[PDB]
Design an enzyme around this catalytic site. Structure first.
Site, short mmCIF file in Angstrom:
data_model
loop_
_atom_site.label_atom_id
_atom_site.label_comp_id
_atom_site.label_asym_id
_atom_site.label_seq_id
_atom_site.Cartn_x
_atom_site.Cartn_y
_atom_site.Cartn_z
CG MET A 340 -2.13 -0.93 1.08
SD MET A 340 -3.26 -0.41 -0.22
CE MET A 340 -4.82 -0.99 0.44
CG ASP A 359 8.84 0.47 6.46
OD1 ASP A 359 9.29 -0.18 7.42
OD2 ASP A 359 7.89 0.06 5.76
N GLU A 418 -3.38 -2.49 10.08
CA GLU A 418 -4.71 -2.13 10.56
C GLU A 418 -4.87 -2.64 11.99
N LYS A 423 -1.82 2.26 15.42
CA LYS A 423 -2.00 3.53 14.74
C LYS A 423 -2.09 4.70 15.72
CG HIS A 466 -9.87 2.27 1.83
ND1 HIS A 466 -10.97 1.49 1.57
CD2 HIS A 466 -8.81 1.42 1.89
CE1 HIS A 466 -10.60 0.22 1.46
NE2 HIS A 466 -9.30 0.15 1.66
#
Lengths: 723, 402, 402
Positions: A340, A359, A418, A423, A466
């Site tokens: 993604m 990252d 997710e 998060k 999204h």
């Protein structure tokens, strides 16, 4: 007759040499469109060419807009009922009578193509004897009528078949409505000459006419198919070479469409082959009868509604807050370099946005930039891009393993795991580091934005963005509104989606949003049928013949089956925590059994299909014994309708609950996001446009839904908003 | 009533496709040669009593165009009142001609009729005439056109017939055809083809491979695999047969019918017409039937047609002594046998088209005359003759020895 | 017995050859359009009871190849058990299909059959299929091939029919065809051709020239004079007819049949089949006959065929109320009338192919349905339908109003 009190759209100009310049300039619009004003203006212009033929030596068709000519009038074509077939037939016959007269004047006619020539636009240029196109960037040339459920009814089918033959015109030009760059068109033969700038077009057209009259006076203004010794490229249907492979044209088409009920490609091929069996004028009339067959049908109205009206209402800002202004984006910070994040970093840098792809490790952050390298290299060898465009935009992507490197960023897009607890900390470690009014986007498929937002200080700038993998190929961006999400934050993200050349939809915070929730009902129906004992081959065929791009069991292998398991666990925690009893979907039992057998999809090596070194094999032979496949053989249409109706009903609930705000976002979001079949026009359009043995429209949809509910479960009962 | 009887049934040997003995022979000459043979057998028969000549022909073009049956009437010196009509019902054409001739006899409006077929596939190949079902896209797309060979592979896939199964039937066909020739079963009905000088051209079915081995058939490549993948016909067939995931391509050139040249002729008339001409009836046409099944799989017509002709005659499978079904593809015969539970000893007892060839328009009349001989040779009673037909059609006929 | 009855008989309008309304229409679409019309008239009829569909077609190639009758069964959604067979007996094909269907009904092995024909001559011209009788030298030389038009001029030469005589018949045909259309004689049997949208394509026989004058026909050039002198066919014909010194070329485009597109359909069944389906029988097929005459003159078949079907029915010329003979050439009709002394008031009373056209494979079924309507319109009893056939063949049929 060349006619059917409107304005005039064509300007006349004859020079001392006898060359007439027809400059198309519709005053009621920004582009030239084949409307009633055009049909009357071209009728008068053609009449005057015939009347003044004794003082006319050539014709040059030009334009005054940025684009040459852009298709037909969609606002009129969409209203054509089956009782209007005579008016449709007469109209396109009149349009082609004008072009055919222009084509047989005995004088050279040159098309000066300055910008885009699409559909009816290219058909006008195809009626000329020589086409010159300006090599300007953005100039598209093609016949995209099939993408609207139509066919090129202004001679596009007849003339391209005459130029290229049945096979090449169908595969390359007609069947897919391919758009071509000017250099491409010159290579295939849609255009004969190129000029660097639009200012050289008309002088080159006049120069070509003067040279054609001197060099080839006998054949000046005579198309190759109007000469006695004309031989169709590839042969006619009666020649032995073409007749040997001709029976494989419908079968290959049936293979490409997977049996989906899309009637336009069938009509194009029928008109192309039937036209090649007869003379040009008879072929043209056959093409008109097939065109009327498509316009008065429901499938063409569905595609016109979605791919013209709905898409335009979206690109105009129908879901954008109608009060906000502009806010630029100087730097973008992407969290996570996986499939993604690396793709998000690509499309953002492709539009020229500076990206700080963060990252955990610099090695993984470089591998995230490497996703752009494999795309920059594969795009370079194909010659699509080359000159520093890839290299400079690849330099804009700055890998980083330090959270401090994301300084000055005013647009955050997190594409990591997710997990809400994750998060919350990832955003907490970054909000103080980036700009104060910075947008804080979160790429999520299930977790509600309102809950995620409670981990930041300025929740008014927290929003869901999204994307869909692969990010470079998927066009939809699902923007999710949190309860605290300001309208300014929505406008800034709406403008960003148009900046990266993607189509946005706006969705209010809810479980599963719109795309993930509605596509869930699609796979749950297929998994239910497999548990019921329906053959897995029939389930996959039902999915492909419905029009989906991927059959459901194959799709359930790509979406990790272990990921689907904990999505149901998250839903069962929503009702059981509210006290109500959870009514589980029987597809969950099929998931747990495949989990129990250690076949959790393609990711873990094997799922509903077998896999061997990254190559999907056939269905798992043990599937039939495990679920006793064959003990239930319902009609194939019931299988197709159960999948289609489940998503349609779920879409209506999303419209009732306020998840979606418009049927335009529903239709386009369903098509571009979850692969809903294009011939339907969208999951919301499927209701108003349903056509079956019950009838056509909302009333027929309801009866068929009540019929499905009586034989497969109460979940197919339509909501009250449809009754 | 006016029952219809078969008084004669003859055929030429079948010449192969590549370097065949009959490639130099006009299709018209094949039919006239058989007419001449019928004159040898009854030189005092009044040919003015022959009211029609009905010939099946699947590719009526070129040498086979222009109503070849009327050309045969005139070129052979038959009476100018003897008619001549060509018909096409694909592989059943030769049997449809016999059925039509028998039905014209029962109507009372025809007394003595010639029926048969002719197909010179080495000169006029299959598909030479065109057709809308294949070449017209709207028709092709709507009816889901799938060539027969892929329908034959689909039948083996659905029924579970393996490559070894269909190759086993192919071996059996080669053996029984060789035994029938060696035992003189065909000596009195296969009329050798000769030229205009009397010189021999062909006297045997040169497509036969009597030394076929199970191992030699296993080395053959699936013929219809390059046609299915490159044409997408597999995906078309499986859209209709959606519960079948994959098509097993078991059929090759060694377990399919051979492409050959040949013609056949059958003489049919009433009892009064035969008695008046001094003819002895060899068998009686009990009943005929036309039916059909799904046109996508194309080759499941024989089972409805056979059940219909059996119900019409008031008979069962057990009442028939010999079943003859054309060997277009091995899986079609195995399917027909599994459908109706045919004892293997009753099915294509003298071999079939896999060994001897399948000259489209003539085959139905060839295998009918084959059954008239074998009923007489075994002194058996009833035979049932049927063929699978392109487009999913079916034709079946019951004859009774007299 | 099982008598055969006609329950429906319909046809399309005939479209002309040059800039014709039907040139854009596939031959398959013409047949399917008529099938759709038959469904409009009996929407509750069980189509599974239809066992066959028999279509005559003289040029079964290209659009008309590959057994167009089976294509029509499948493209129209008819039951897959409903058969489909193409046949060719030249101009009598459409009537041969009706005769064959009636004979299949009498046999008891078929209960309800569709018969008819189709010929799209603007798309698939005459002679597109080839043929040995014309193109094979040995066959051509032996049978003395003479094209029909020269045989038609020979008939006028032998019988003494002048240019004014044949042109007089041609005028009469134009008049009676115009009177039949004006009086609504054809309104219920001519089914207008429409496209896939319901839009009209053709609703009338556009080959007709109702304003033809005797003087306008006299200006026309003999069509077959350039073919006879340059091909030597005159000398071939006169070698057979050695007592005739010179051939008078009286036939032109104005006194010959027109080249047109069209199709026809007839529904035939037993009394039990019609009663079971709620159908009312319009006429009964009394008898059929096939015969023929000299193949050099080619066009004297109707007289033996008519005499044979009359003897078979136990009837005389005086027992028939309407004679319908196809107007391939004017001298053929005048010859047939002089042979059997037909009262002019009984002969082709609604006009014929000279005015309305001659779509080879369909014509026989067109003029048969024309006679079913006219027998009912006049409340007459018996009609005789016959056609001249290339190769010297003859076909005749007697129907009786019910």
């Amino acid at each position: 007759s060349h006619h059917h009190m409107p304005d005039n759209t064509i300007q006349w100009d004859k020079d001392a040499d006898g060359i007439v310049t027809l400059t198309m300039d519709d005053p009621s619009g920004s582009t030239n469109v084949m409307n009633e004003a055009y049909i009357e203006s071209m009728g008068k212009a053609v009449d005057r060419l015939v009347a003044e033929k004794d003082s006319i030596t050539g014709v040059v068709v030009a334009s005054a807009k940025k684009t040459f000519f852009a298709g037909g009038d969609v606002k009129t074509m969409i209203q054509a009922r089956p009782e209007d077939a005579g008016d449709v037939f007469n109209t396109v016959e009149t349009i082609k009578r004008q072009l055919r007269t222009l084509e047989t004047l005995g004088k050279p006619v040159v098309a000066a193509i300055n910008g885009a020539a699409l559909g009816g636009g290219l058909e006008i240029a195809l009626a000329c004897h020589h086409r010159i196109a300006a090599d300007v960037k953005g100039s598209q040339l093609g016949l995209p009528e099939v993408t609207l459920g139509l066919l090129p009814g202004g001679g596009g089918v007849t003339r391209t078949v005459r130029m290229f033959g049945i096979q090449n015109a169908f595969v390359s030009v007609l069947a897919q409505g391919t758009r071509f760059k000017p250099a491409k068109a010159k290579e295939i033969g849609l255009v004969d000459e190129l000029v660097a700038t639009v200012e050289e077009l008309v002088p080159a057209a006049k120069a070509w006419i003067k040279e054609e009259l001197k060099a080839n006076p006998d054949g000046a203004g005579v198309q190759p198919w109007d000469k006695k010794g004309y031989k169709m490229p590839g042969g006619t249907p009666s020649s032995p070479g073409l007749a040997a492979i001709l029976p494989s044209f419908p079968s290959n088409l049936r293979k490409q469409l997977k049996g989906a009920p899309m009637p336009a490609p069938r009509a194009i091929l029928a008109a192309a082959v039937e036209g090649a069996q007869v003379d040009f004028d008879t072929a043209s009339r056959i093409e008109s009868r097939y065109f009327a067959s498509l316009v008065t049908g429901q499938v063409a109205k569905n595609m016109m509604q979605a791919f013209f009206f709905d898409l335009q209402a979206i690109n105009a800002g129908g879901s954008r807050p109608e009060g906000i202004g502009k806010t630029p984006i100087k730097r973008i910070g992407v969290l996570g370099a996986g499939m993604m994040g690396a793709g998000i970093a690509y499309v953002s840098a492709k539009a020229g946005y500076e990206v700080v792809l963060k990252d955990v490790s610099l090695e993984a952050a470089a591998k995230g930039k490497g996703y752009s390298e494999k795309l920059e290299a594969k795009a370079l060898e194909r010659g699509r891009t080359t000159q520093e465009r890839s290299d400079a935009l690849l330099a804009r992507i700055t890998p980083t393993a330090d959270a401090a490197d994301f300084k000055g960023v005013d647009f955050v897009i997190e594409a990591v795991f997710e997990n809400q607890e994750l998060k919350h900390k990832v955003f907490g470690e970054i909000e103080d580091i980036v700009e104060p009014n910075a947008i804080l986007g979160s790429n999520t498929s299930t977790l509600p934005i309102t809950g995620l937002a409670t981990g930041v200080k300025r929740q008014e700038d927290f929003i869901g963005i999204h994307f869909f993998s692969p990010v470079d190929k998927m066009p939809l961006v699902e923007i999710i509104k949190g309860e605290k999400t300001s309208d300014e934050a929505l406008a800034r993200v709406f403008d960003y989606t148009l900046a990266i050349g993607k189509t946005p939809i706006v969705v209010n915070d809810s479980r599963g949003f719109f795309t993930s929730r509605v596509i869930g009902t699609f796979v749950n129906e297929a998994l239910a049928m497999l548990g019921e004992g329906v053959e897995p081959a029939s389930i996959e065929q039902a999915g492909s013949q419905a029009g989906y791009p991927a059959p459901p069991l194959q799709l359930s292998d790509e979406l990790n089956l272990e990921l689907m398991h904990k999505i149901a666990v998250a839903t069962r925690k929503g009702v059981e925590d509210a006290g109500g009893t959870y009514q589980p979907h029987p597809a969950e039992a099929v998931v747990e059994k495949m989990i129990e057998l250690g076949r959790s999809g393609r990711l873990k090596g094997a799922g509903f299909y077998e896999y061997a070194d990254g190559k999907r094999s056939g269905l798992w032979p043990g599937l039939r014994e495990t679920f006793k496949s064959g003990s239930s053989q319902p009609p194939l249409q019931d299988m197709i309708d159960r999948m289609l109706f489940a998503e349609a009903l779920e879409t209506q609930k999303c419209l009732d609950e306020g998840v979606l705000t418009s049927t335009a976002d529903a239709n386009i979001g369903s098509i571009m996001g979850i692969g809903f079949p294009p011939w339907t026009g969208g999951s919301a359009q499927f209701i108003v446009g349903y056509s079956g043995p019950a009838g056509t429209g909302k009333a027929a949809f309801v009866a068929r839904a009540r019929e499905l509910a009586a034989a497969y479960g109460d979940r197919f009962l339509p909501p009250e908003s449809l009754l | 009533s006016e029952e219809a009887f078969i008084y004669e049934a003859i055929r030429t040997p079948r010449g192969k496709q590549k370097n065949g003995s009959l490639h130099e022979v006009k299709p018209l000459s094949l039919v006239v040669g058989l007419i001449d043979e019928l004159r040898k057998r009854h030189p005092d028969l009044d040919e003015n009593l022959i009211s029609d000549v009905i010939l099946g022909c699947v590719s009526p073009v070129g040498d086979q165009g222009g109503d070849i049956a009327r050309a045969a009437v005139l070129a052979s010196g038959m009476p100018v009142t003897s008619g001549g009509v060509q018909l096409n019902r694909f592989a059943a054409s030769g049997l449809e001609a016999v059925n039509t001739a028998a039905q014209k006899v029962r109507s009372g409006w025809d007394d003595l009729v010639l029926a048969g077929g002719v197909e010179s596939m080495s000169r006029v190949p299959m598909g030479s005439d065109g057709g809308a079902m294949g070449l017209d896209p709207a028709t092709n797309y709507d009816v889901m056109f799938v060539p027969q060979s892929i329908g034959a592979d689909l039948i083996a896939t659905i029924e579970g017939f393996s490559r070894e199964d269909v190759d086993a039937y192919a071996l059996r066909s080669q053996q029984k055809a060789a035994e029938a020739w060696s035992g003189g079963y065909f000596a009195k009905s296969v009329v050798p083809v000769r030229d205009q000088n009397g010189l021999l051209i062909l006297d045997h079915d040169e497509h036969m491979r009597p030394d076929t081995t199970k191992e030699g058939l296993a080395k053959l490549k699936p013929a219809f695999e390059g046609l299915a993948a490159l044409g997408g016909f597999d995906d078309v067939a499986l859209q209709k047969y959606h519960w079948v995931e994959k098509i097993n391509h078991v059929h090759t050139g060694g377990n399919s019918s051979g492409i050959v040249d040949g013609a056949a002729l059958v003489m049919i008339g009433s009892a009064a017409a035969g008695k008046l001409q001094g003819l002895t009836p060899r068998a009686r046409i009990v009943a005929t039937a036309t039916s059909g099944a799904d046109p996508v799989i194309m080759l499941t017509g024989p089972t409805p047609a056979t059940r219909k002709v059996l119900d019409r005659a008031g008979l069962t499978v057990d009442d028939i002594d010999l079943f003859e079904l054309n060997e277009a593809f091995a899986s079609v015969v195995l399917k027909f046998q599994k459908d109706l539970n045919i004892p293997d000893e009753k099915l294509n007892v003298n071999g079939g088209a896999i060994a001897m060839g399948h000259p489209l328009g003539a085959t139905g009349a060839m295998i009918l005359g084959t059954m008239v001989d074998e009923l007489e040779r075994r002194n058996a009673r009833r035979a049932l003759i049927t063929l699978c037909i392109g487009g999913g059609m079916g034709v079946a006929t019951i004859i009774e020895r007299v």
